């Protein structure tokens, strides 16, 4: 039922989606049984000073947010796109010296990517920060 | 042994530059001996997965080279100014609210700062990435 309901949406990325979640800096996987602990890291600076071992921090505790709450049948969307706001502001693109860019990676289960298909297929359109901020701001309905 | 300089350096720090070597999203310290090791982490990852201690690692290198190159007579200055734009790409403040918007650290030989005050006054009133992209890419003088 797990790997079950994986496949369609899979299938349904395949088919519809062109094989991929890509959006601006961030892309989205779609998983029963993320391996959150691989997306982990082990992160110290020594007396006392903010080398940025907190943004890595912070932004793991945002990712395992995200796919969490959208492992349960009716979360709040408004306050789960707010996370993802929170996750989109403290990610910081690793664009490796030159002129190349990387992107963020999210997590969100199949039941949850099935119940908002236009919205994820948005996702992918959003082509600036001004952009992305509208899409992502909290409406009531 | 070598405070003289250092102060000779805090002394015009303070007496010309209001106290302080502040600019966009980053500061300037002068230090004869910094404790670089001080400021420093020791991070990995788990998978082949890239979790942002690159980054880190990759500051810490630059911030390093900033200092050691400024701590010799007679480098590259258009070169030293390319490792600070490879930092000052590299960086990015942590955004969590808004508030906080935070500053990287530089640090640089009092001998240094004493042959280009000028350009550090220059480097304070910055205030814009795009100032700051042509600031440090143009040759100076």
Redesign the interface.
Do not use: A, V
């Given at each position: 039922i797990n790997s079950l309901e994986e496949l369609a949406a899979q299938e349904l990325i395949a088919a519809q989606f062109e094989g991929n979640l890509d959006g601006f800096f961030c892309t989205f996987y779609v998983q029963s049984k993320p391996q959150l602990?691989?997306?982990?890291?082990?992160?110290?600076?020594?007396?006392d000073?903010?080398?940025?071992?907190?943004?890595?921090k912070?932004?793991?505790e945002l990712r395992k947010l995200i796919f969490l709450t959208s492992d349960v049948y009716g979360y709040n969307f408004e306050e789960w796109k707010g996370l993802v706001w929170?996750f989109v502001?403290?990610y910081?693109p690793?664009?490796r010296?030159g002129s190349t860019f990387?992107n963020g990676?999210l997590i969100v289960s199949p039941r949850f990517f099935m119940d908002h298909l236009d919205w994820f297929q948005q996702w992918k359109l959003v082509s600036s920060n001004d952009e992305c901020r509208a899409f992502l701001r909290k409406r009531t309905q």
């Open positions: 602990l691989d997306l982990e890291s082990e992160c110290y600076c020594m007396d000073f903010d080398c940025g071992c907190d943004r890595i912070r932004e793991e929170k502001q403290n910081c690793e664009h010296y990387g990676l």
